[PDB]
Amino acid sequence: GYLTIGGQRYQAEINDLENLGEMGSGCGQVWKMRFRKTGHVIAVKQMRRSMDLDVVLKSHDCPYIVQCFGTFITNTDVFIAMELMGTCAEKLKKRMQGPIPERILGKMTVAIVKALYYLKEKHGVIHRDVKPSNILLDERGQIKLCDFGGCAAYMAPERIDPPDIRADVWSLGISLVELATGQFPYKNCKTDFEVLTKVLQEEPPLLPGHMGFSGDFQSFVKDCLTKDHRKRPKYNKLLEHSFIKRYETLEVDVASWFKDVMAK
């Protein structure tokens, strides 16, 4: 092992686990598994070989981080056991062609920021890889971050300057803009390079004043996409922002929405 589920840490082996179905949107290979010892169904990611995700295994008490049960090693893989989620956000954007509603993106922002905040505070971590593949939603309305600390547009304006987490705030901005609208925020692209150019090159791709987004939403997104990184806000700051304040507070049935969007 070990598998730690439900407060107790257990010795375990991947072959000991019963394999059911395979997934997923996430691509994986991600597996659906059962741990005979406690009865729980879970998700196992299997990857090929050549780490310190110990932390996601230590972040059981943040409800916006996807729960990590434990890690397994072999000849070939490298198995990661985790709580099972419904899907990625990237998959949702494609699975519906259109944009994702602000009320959902609002709930998501709250979850995303509070998770990023926890990581920094509880374990002085900088997620880095903040983007729609890293935002998981479920049948039951939960929204969570994972894993791994292009990967191109999501690049901040700094972070490609001198060889010397506002970078994460940036990536948050980009994803939002991308997930709000329904198309990447740097549309016509000569991949990888033109993209990175524009980031440093043009003016931060704020939210269309055209589409019916609120002024708190457009304001959240704008502060995130602050080119000067120094005058860009910390998590402490965004958490006081009215977009977040509103969305901590506001009933939004993410559950039924997710369910319904699924049926397509």
The answer on 62 and 106 residing in a single domain is no
The answer on 92 and 78 residing in a single domain is no
Active site residues: 129
28 known member of a binding site: yes
Strands 41-46 and 8-10, sheet pairing: unpaired
Which residue do the tokens 């880095």 mark?
Answer: 128
Among 85, 118, 148, which residue terminates a domain? 85
Number of domains in the chain: 2
How many CA atoms does the CB half-sphere of 52 hold within 13 Å?
Answer: 4
Method: X-ray
The answer on 80 and 97 residing in a single domain is no
The answer on 95 and 79 residing in a single domain is no
User: Cβ distance 165 to 120 under 8 Å?
Assistant: yes
Q: In this structure, what CATH number is given to the domain that contains residue 64?
A: 3.30.200.20
Range of the domain at 52: 1-85
29 known member of a binding site: yes
CA distance 126 to 164: 17
Q: In this structure, what CATH number is given to the domain that contains residue 209?
A: 1.10.510.10
The answer on 227 and 135 residing in a single domain is yes
201 known member of a binding site: no
Q: What is the CA radius of gyration of the chain?
A: 19
DSSP characters over 123-135: H-------SGGGE
Q: Which residues contact 77 (CB under 8 A, 6 or more apart)?
A: 46, 47, 48, 49
CA distance 221 to 77: 39
User: Cβ distance 176 to 99 under 8 Å?
Assistant: no
Among 19, 52, 85, which residue terminates a domain? 85
User: Cβ distance 141 to 168 under 8 Å?
Assistant: no
CA distance 103 to 217: 10
27 known member of a binding site: yes
